[PDB]
Each structure stands twice: as C-alpha cells, then as structure tokens.
Paper text:
Immature tip links are likely formed by homotetrameric [name] ([name]) proteins, while mature tip links are made of cadherin-23 (CDH23) and [name] heterotetramers.
The first unique structural feature of [name] [name]–10 is a canonical-like calcium-binding site at the [name]–9 linker with a novel torsion between these EC repeats. As expected, the structure shows three bound calcium ions. In [name] [name]–9, the side chain of Asp 933 in the DXD motif, which usually bridges calcium ions at sites 2 and 3, only coordinates calcium at site 3 in a ‘canonical-like' architecture.
Author numbering: 795 to 1127
Amino acid sequence: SPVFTNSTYTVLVEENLPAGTTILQIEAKDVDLGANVSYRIRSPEVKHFFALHPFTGELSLLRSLDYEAFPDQEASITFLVEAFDIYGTMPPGIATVTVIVKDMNDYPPVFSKRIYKGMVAPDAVKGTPITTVYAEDADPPGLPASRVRYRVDDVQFPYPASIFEVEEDSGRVITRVNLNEEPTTIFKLVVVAFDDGEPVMSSSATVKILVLHPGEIPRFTQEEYRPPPVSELATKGTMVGVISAAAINQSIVYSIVSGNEEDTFGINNITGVIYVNGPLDYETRTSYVLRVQADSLEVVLANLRVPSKSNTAKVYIEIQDENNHPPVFLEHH
Ligand SMILES: [Ca+2]
Ligand SMILES: [Ca+2]
Ligand SMILES: [Ca+2]
Ligand SMILES: [Cl-]
C-alpha cells in the first residue's frame, strides 16, 4: 500500500492552456518493493477534464480550462487520486488534488470598423484633428484586461506612421508634425488597439487619409435651391433653375447624385444649369427633390468624390398643373 509524498496537492492553472499540458506530477512510494507504483484517477467525473499517466504520475488537461465557465467562486476542481503497488493490492494509497483555475484575459479589443476614412490638408500644422477610432473590449469592465489603448503601427506602412499619430487614450488621430504632402494622396495608417491583460491582446484597423485643402471643396451658394414652378407642358431643354458654387483655384463640376432616376431632368455639369430632359405629367408626378453636388476638377480627374456639408445641396422642383379647372359648384357626395 503506497504512501503519497504529499497527502494533498493544490495547483493553480491558467485558463486557456491547450489540451495536453502537464499541470502536476504526483508521487507515492511502495515501502516494500521501492518500485513499479502506478496511479489512477478515482473520481470518475473529472476524466472530463484530466488524464493521469498511470506510471509517471503526470496529470494533464484533456481540454483547455475556462475560468468564466464555472459558477461564481467555484472555479476549482477537487478530486481523489489513488496509487497501487505492482500487484494492484487493495486498498491503494489515496490523495486529494485541487486544481484552481486562474482567470486570464480572453478577448482582444475590437474596432468599430475595419476601415476608417478621414481628410487632412497638405500643409496641416502639427496637431490637426483628422478622425477618431474606437474599440471595445469584451472582458470584465473596469479591469486592466478591458482597458483600451491605441497606437499606430509602422510594420506594413511606415511612412504614415511618421506623419500621423493617435492619442493613446482617446483614439483621436492627428498630424504628428507639420505636413507637406500632395493633394489627392491617400495614406493608409495602421492603428492598433491593445489592452492590459495577462497576456496582452490587440487587433488593428486602417485609417485611410485623403490629402486635400478644405478650402478647395466647393461651397454652394445655398443649402436648398427652390426654383419657380416648372410647367407640366415644358418642352425638352426648358430651363428649370441654376445651382452654383465657388472654390479656391478650381474649376467646378456639377452633378445630380440622386432623385432623378427617371432622367426627367438633366444638368449641364459646367454651367450648373438644370433643364427639363424628359416629358412631364402633373397626374403622374407633382414634385421632385434632387440631391446635387459640386466637385473640384482636381478631385474628379483623380476619380474621387468628396461629399461634404457645403458641396451638397437639395433642389426642390415643383410641377405646375395645367389641367386644373374646377367647376363653379358640384352636386357632390
Ligand atoms: Ca474564458
Ligand atoms: Ca477571463
Ligand atoms: Ca481584453
Ligand atoms: Cl501613435
């Protein structure tokens, strides 16, 4: 009847170690034979978690542990192990094992988007705001393991990382230095959100940054254009109204971006004059709302559109009924 070197074992085991990890070695001695002692787990309900090598006495995980999967306060498993002499003589030696599961950081921070966009001026001074990134951490709140911090990464795109920075706590992305870059360029800046858990986990996203002078994005003369009624009878080419913007050093190109799916209207993209393009019918349709936009030649020639507050407007077009002659009185009901 072997006797265990210790009559109880306690061991602390990190959650999320992989299947196979040896976590404890036990030992009993046969005082007579001094050899060939063998071991066995006696509490059959824990063969769900562990295996015990019959000759080495090494205990290992059959599956990784999960701290959060246990009832509150109960993240520990206690059980009996037994040791026999070579013959398997009855009663064996018996000891207690207690495996306590240590809580660990489970999740990385996750960004609200895979790709953020922003803009910056070619000559922007150090500290110009560009955009904010944001990540959340699924781990227990208020702990170092769910505390988010941001930084840039220079492994894949080192240059952007040298002209842009992100504030460690707020996730505001800003210019690191006074800029001197080419209008129309689009940088990819890689940002990383990391926590403060054991271990540390992180993920990353991309901020695409377009270089362009804010002043070279056109400003419409109005937010809402409300030209006079257009007659139901208007022939093709009749003028509806005219939109207009100014931009610094730029030719401007005008367009209709939505609301005109029937091609009932058209726009001269250079003059900004909106005209009747198809047939009109008051019974069929009495009013329209077009979304128009103004862009710089430079931006167009670069196959870009940049919709801002000021280079987008709505045009309200109201049709005039020409077949409206209600009678003097009607014997109605
Ligand atoms: Ca867990
Ligand atoms: Ca955990
Ligand atoms: Ca975390
Ligand atoms: Cl940074």
